[PDB]
Paper text:
[name]-[name] is a well-characterised phospho-tyrosine specific [name], widely expressed in human tissues and conserved through evolution. The ligand-binding interface of [name]-[name] comprises the active site P-loop, the adjacent DPYY-loop (D-loop) and the variable region or variable loop. The catalytic residues C12 (nucleophile) and R18 (phosphate binding) are located in the P-loop, and D129 (general acid/base) in the D-loop. We demonstrate here that minimal re-design of [name]-[name], by mutating only two residues, is sufficient to introduce new enzymatic activity towards four different phosphoinositide (PI) substrates.
Mammalian lipid phosphatases (PTEN, INPP4A, and INPP4B) have a conserved lysine in the P-loop that is important for substrate binding. In the [name]-[name]-WT this lysine corresponds to an isoleucine in position 16 of and thus we used the [name]-[name]-[name] mutant as starting template for RosettaDesign in DS2. In order to assess the actual impact of the designed mutations on the protein structure, we determined the crystal structures of the [name] and L13R-[name] mutants at 1.8Å and 2.0Å resolution respectively. In both cases, the structures are similar to the WT enzyme with overall root-mean deviations (RMSDs) of 0.288 Å and 0.265 Å respectively. There are no structural distortions in main chain of the P-loop or the variable region, thus the mutations introduced do not alter the tertiary structure of the protein, consistent with a catalytically active enzyme. However, in both structures, the side chain of W49 is in the open position, away from the active site, thus confirming the flexibility of this side chain as suggested from the kinetics characterisation. Importantly, the crystal structures of the K16 and R13-K16 designs show that mutations introduced in the new enzymes do not alter the 3D structure of the protein or the position of the catalytic residues. This ensures that the catalytic mechanism remains unaltered in the mutants.
Numbering used by the authors: 5 to 157
Amino acid sequence: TKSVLFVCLGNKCRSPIAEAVFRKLVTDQNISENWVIDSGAVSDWNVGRSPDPRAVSCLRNHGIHTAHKARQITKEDFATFDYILCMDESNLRDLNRKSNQVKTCKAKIELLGSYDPQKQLIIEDPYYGNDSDFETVYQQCVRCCRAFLEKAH
């Protein structure tokens, strides 16, 4: 098996959409059983919370559902995941710093948008935006997730 953890600051908007998009992808390709997929937060502030309703509604528009509840990344995640794919530069900075406080970091830590063929590198926080911003995130996630499944960096 291979494993990937999608991360943003709060684990309520972007990373639960990424997680759900990627889970749909590996189920559609009949290889769900060879993947451990999760999402998590830099911050502990939103722990326990369901995804933003606008993320739920966006996923529903695309026939996808998630049961995810927000959790904070742990030191153990750095030792167990093959890939930690995050949304923006703030996330990358925080994860790289946290990476440096663990003895063994197995995980490669990359921006999810570094996989985008259309080269939009940052998946911007939609929380203060509107439902069109959630849809842009979903579409970016589709492109990046399918590029990552094809070939990892």
